[PDB]
Design an enzyme around this catalytic site. Structure first.
Site, PDB file in Angstrom:
ATOM      1  N   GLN A 114       8.834   1.500  -5.296  1.00  0.00           N
ATOM      2  CA  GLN A 114      10.272   1.357  -5.505  1.00  0.00           C
ATOM      3  C   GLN A 114      10.918   1.003  -4.167  1.00  0.00           C
ATOM      4  OE1 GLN A 114      12.079   4.421  -8.075  1.00  0.00           O
ATOM      5  NE2 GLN A 114      10.028   5.329  -8.161  1.00  0.00           N
ATOM      6  N   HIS A 126      14.818 -23.380   2.403  1.00  0.00           N
ATOM      7  CA  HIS A 126      14.960 -24.233   3.588  1.00  0.00           C
ATOM      8  C   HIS A 126      13.798 -24.000   4.547  1.00  0.00           C
ATOM      9  CE1 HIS A 126      17.485 -26.126   6.932  1.00  0.00           C
ATOM     10  NE2 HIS A 126      16.589 -25.434   7.621  1.00  0.00           N
ATOM     11  N   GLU A 127      13.504 -22.730   4.822  1.00  0.00           N
ATOM     12  CA  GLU A 127      12.455 -22.400   5.786  1.00  0.00           C
ATOM     13  C   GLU A 127      11.075 -22.777   5.264  1.00  0.00           C
ATOM     14  OE1 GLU A 127      13.157 -21.975   8.612  1.00  0.00           O
ATOM     15  OE2 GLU A 127      15.222 -21.236   8.549  1.00  0.00           O
ATOM     16  N   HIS A 172      10.314 -26.375   5.676  1.00  0.00           N
ATOM     17  CA  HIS A 172       9.827 -26.806   6.989  1.00  0.00           C
ATOM     18  C   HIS A 172       8.297 -26.809   7.026  1.00  0.00           C
ATOM     19  CE1 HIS A 172      13.453 -27.525   9.236  1.00  0.00           C
ATOM     20  NE2 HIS A 172      13.903 -26.285   9.180  1.00  0.00           N
ATOM     21  N   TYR A 199      10.913 -32.705  15.614  1.00  0.00           N
ATOM     22  CA  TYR A 199      12.159 -31.941  15.506  1.00  0.00           C
ATOM     23  C   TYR A 199      13.148 -32.281  16.619  1.00  0.00           C
ATOM     24  CZ  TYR A 199      14.883 -28.017  13.587  1.00  0.00           C
ATOM     25  OH  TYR A 199      15.844 -27.213  12.997  1.00  0.00           O
ATOM     26  N   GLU A 246      15.669 -31.558   9.036  1.00  0.00           N
ATOM     27  CA  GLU A 246      16.669 -30.585   8.603  1.00  0.00           C
ATOM     28  C   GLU A 246      17.208 -30.905   7.215  1.00  0.00           C
ATOM     29  OE1 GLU A 246      16.288 -27.518  10.329  1.00  0.00           O
ATOM     30  OE2 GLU A 246      18.288 -27.660   9.434  1.00  0.00           O
ATOM     31  N   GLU A 290      17.727 -23.480  -5.149  1.00  0.00           N
ATOM     32  CA  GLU A 290      18.855 -22.667  -5.595  1.00  0.00           C
ATOM     33  C   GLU A 290      19.291 -23.056  -7.005  1.00  0.00           C
ATOM     34  OE1 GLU A 290      21.856 -21.653  -2.588  1.00  0.00           O
ATOM     35  OE2 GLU A 290      23.422 -22.110  -4.034  1.00  0.00           O
ATOM     36  N   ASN A 330      24.426 -18.782  -9.237  1.00  0.00           N
ATOM     37  CA  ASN A 330      25.525 -19.282  -8.428  1.00  0.00           C
ATOM     38  C   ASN A 330      25.148 -20.499  -7.570  1.00  0.00           C
ATOM     39  OD1 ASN A 330      27.293 -17.118  -9.243  1.00  0.00           O
ATOM     40  ND2 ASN A 330      26.179 -15.793  -7.815  1.00  0.00           N
ATOM     41  N   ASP A 351      25.059 -24.186  -5.725  1.00  0.00           N
ATOM     42  CA  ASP A 351      26.051 -25.033  -5.092  1.00  0.00           C
ATOM     43  C   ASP A 351      25.341 -25.964  -4.123  1.00  0.00           C
ATOM     44  OD1 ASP A 351      26.667 -21.954  -3.723  1.00  0.00           O
ATOM     45  OD2 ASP A 351      25.673 -23.545  -2.530  1.00  0.00           O
ATOM     46  N   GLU A 409      26.220 -26.029  -0.857  1.00  0.00           N
ATOM     47  CA  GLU A 409      26.436 -25.493   0.481  1.00  0.00           C
ATOM     48  C   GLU A 409      25.228 -24.661   0.886  1.00  0.00           C
ATOM     49  OE1 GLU A 409      30.242 -24.308   1.667  1.00  0.00           O
ATOM     50  OE2 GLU A 409      31.226 -25.803   0.403  1.00  0.00           O
ATOM     51  N   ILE A 447      34.430 -13.254   5.382  1.00  0.00           N
ATOM     52  CA  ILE A 447      35.139 -14.496   5.077  1.00  0.00           C
ATOM     53  C   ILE A 447      34.583 -15.055   3.775  1.00  0.00           C
ATOM     54  CG2 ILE A 447      35.779 -16.794   5.878  1.00  0.00           C
ATOM     55  CD1 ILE A 447      35.237 -15.833   8.714  1.00  0.00           C
ATOM     56  N   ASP A 453      21.319 -28.994  20.546  1.00  0.00           N
ATOM     57  CA  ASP A 453      20.733 -28.797  19.220  1.00  0.00           C
ATOM     58  C   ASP A 453      19.611 -29.805  18.965  1.00  0.00           C
ATOM     59  OD1 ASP A 453      20.509 -27.683  16.558  1.00  0.00           O
ATOM     60  OD2 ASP A 453      21.847 -29.270  15.822  1.00  0.00           O
ATOM     61  N   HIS A 471      20.921 -30.147  13.398  1.00  0.00           N
ATOM     62  CA  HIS A 471      21.697 -29.425  12.390  1.00  0.00           C
ATOM     63  C   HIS A 471      23.089 -30.005  12.210  1.00  0.00           C
ATOM     64  CE1 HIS A 471      18.765 -26.329  13.833  1.00  0.00           C
ATOM     65  NE2 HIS A 471      18.691 -26.054  12.542  1.00  0.00           N
TER      66      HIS A 471
HETATM   67  C1  LIG Z   1      21.742 -23.945  15.440  1.00  0.00           C
HETATM   68  C2  LIG Z   1      21.511 -23.784  13.986  1.00  0.00           C
HETATM   69  C3  LIG Z   1      20.500 -23.301  13.245  1.00  0.00           C
HETATM   70  C4  LIG Z   1      20.910 -23.457  11.913  1.00  0.00           C
HETATM   71  C5  LIG Z   1      20.131 -23.189  10.681  1.00  0.00           C
HETATM   72  O1  LIG Z   1      20.158 -23.970   9.737  1.00  0.00           O
HETATM   73  N1  LIG Z   1      19.383 -22.086  10.660  1.00  0.00           N
HETATM   74  C6  LIG Z   1      18.355 -21.877   9.650  1.00  0.00           C
HETATM   75  C7  LIG Z   1      18.946 -21.158   8.372  1.00  0.00           C
HETATM   76  F1  LIG Z   1      18.127 -21.251   7.318  1.00  0.00           F
HETATM   77  F2  LIG Z   1      19.147 -19.874   8.576  1.00  0.00           F
HETATM   78  F3  LIG Z   1      20.113 -21.677   7.999  1.00  0.00           F
HETATM   79  N2  LIG Z   1      22.115 -23.993  11.827  1.00  0.00           N
HETATM   80  O2  LIG Z   1      22.501 -24.210  13.173  1.00  0.00           O
HETATM   81 CA   LIG Z   2      31.239 -15.815   4.256  1.00  0.00          CA
HETATM   82 CA   LIG Z   3      23.743 -22.672  -1.385  1.00  0.00          CA
HETATM   83 CA   LIG Z   4       9.786   3.246  -1.827  1.00  0.00          CA
HETATM   84 CA   LIG Z   5      25.071 -20.323  -4.101  1.00  0.00          CA
HETATM   85 ZN   LIG Z   6      15.861 -25.827   9.460  1.00  0.00          ZN
END
Ligand SMILES: Cc1cc(C(=O)NCC(F)(F)F)no1
Ligand SMILES: [Ca+2]
Ligand SMILES: [Ca+2]
Ligand SMILES: [Ca+2]
Ligand SMILES: [Ca+2]
Ligand SMILES: [Zn+2]
Length: 316
Positions: free
Chosen positions: A61, A142-143, A146, A157, A166, A177, A183, A185, A187, A197, A226, A231
């Site tokens: 658990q 996203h990760e 990669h 990169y 990226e 997603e 939910n 989107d 974004e 926020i 960057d 990014h």
């Molecule tokens: C600088 C920088 C790194 C990132 C980013 O995308 N991070 C990986 C995430 F998956 F957490 F979003 N955006 O600006």
């Molecule tokens: Ca927020």
């Molecule tokens: Ca999203």
């Molecule tokens: Ca536990």
């Molecule tokens: Ca979402």
């Molecule tokens: Zn990335």
């Protein structure tokens, strides 16, 4: 570890209850044997040594606050595995069911997540800029994407190839997603960014300029921050992908959308068949045009829409 496959239950970063695949041998481990050669989740214990310790739990658990980032890293790695397998017939990130490893509680107050060449790594955030970053399904996917890129196109990169790297991760993070259909989107990171926020995120694909990122090649960042804006200039490619899927008129160029599934097919084929480590934006356009031609025909609407989308963002 060697043991028997079990199913635990816990709560994620956002307080939602979910079942997770575990392994029992004295303890219950965050080891999912139902996908490939396993999904394994580790406790980095607020330090920077990786991977840390395979996550062990006495009762299967996972409702403690400390457990929540591990629950979500583990569960969303599984969802992402399912997406690649069921949608693209790809078995894990290497196509051969490589074990997927993640560590959570990386460092202290760490406002990022990353793929380190071998595994996924998630900070907990500082509680103001981020909450624990595995709470974002788009972040997790996203990760893991990669890793897919590392084994396929191998986009270096930096500069334009890095901005493509990226954008590929943002595209498939978003498509995962939508696949999970909670939910969804266009974004990135909205579920874990700035708990104080409402309605913001790290990036927008549908309107990158909403957070200051470019939406046209003429607005690209040309400096050295960057890794040459990977990014930042990703917004140019993210906008093209959004337009291919959903359509729109952008800087006076109209694009007929062809939907998310076809977007995914076109960019997956481009990633795995045509892109190279040094591909630039113009070469990505050519790769996407060719992929859409392979899949739908030279005279198809799909090919026409890819061209309009790259036209709209100034990429020839
Ligand atoms: C600088 C920088 C790194 C990132 C980013 O995308 N991070 C990986 C995430 F998956 F957490 F979003 N955006 O600006
Ligand atoms: Ca927020
Ligand atoms: Ca999203
Ligand atoms: Ca536990
Ligand atoms: Ca979402
Ligand atoms: Zn990335």
């Amino acid at each position: 570890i060697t043991g028997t496959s079990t199913v635990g239950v816990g709560r994620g970063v956002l307080g939602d209850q979910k079942n997770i695949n575990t392994t029992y041998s004295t303890y219950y481990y965050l080891q999912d044997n139902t996908r490939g050669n396993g999904i394994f989740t580790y406790d980095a214990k607020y330090r920077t040594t990786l991977p840390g310790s395979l996550w062990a739990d006495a009762d299967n658990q996972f409702f403690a606050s400390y457990d929540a980032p591990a629950v979500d890293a583990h569960y969303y790695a599984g969802v992402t595995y399912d997406y690649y397998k069921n949608v693209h017939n790809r078995l894990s990130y290497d196509g051969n069911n490589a074990a997927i490893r993640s560590s959570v509680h990386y460092s202290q107050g760490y406002n990022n997540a990353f793929w380190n060449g071998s595994q996924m790594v998630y900070g907990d955030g500082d509680g103001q800029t981020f909450i624990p970053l595995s709470g974002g399904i788009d972040v997790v996917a996203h990760e893991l994407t990669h890793a897919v890129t590392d084994y396929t196109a191998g986009l270096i990169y930096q500069n334009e190839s890095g901005a493509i790297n990226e954008a590929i991760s943002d595209i498939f993070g978003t498509l995962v997603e939508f696949y999970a259909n909670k939910n969804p989107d266009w974004e990135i990171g909205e579920d874990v960014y700035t708990p104080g926020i409402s309605g913001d995120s790290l990036r927008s694909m549908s309107d990158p300029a909403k957070y200051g990122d470019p939406d046209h090649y003429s607005k690209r960042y040309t400096g050295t921050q960057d890794n040459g804006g990977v990014h930042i200039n990703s917004g140019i490619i993210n906008k093209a992908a959004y337009l291919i899927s959903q359509g729109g008129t952008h800087y006076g160029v109209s694009v007929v959308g062809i939907g998310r599934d076809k977007l995914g097919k076109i960019f997956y084929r481009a990633l795995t068949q045509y892109l190279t480590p040094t591909s630039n934006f113009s070469q990505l356009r050519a790769a996407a045009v060719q992929s859409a031609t392979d899949l739908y025909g030279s005279t198809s609407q799909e090919v026409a829409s890819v061209k309009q989308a790259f036209d709209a963002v100034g990429v020839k």
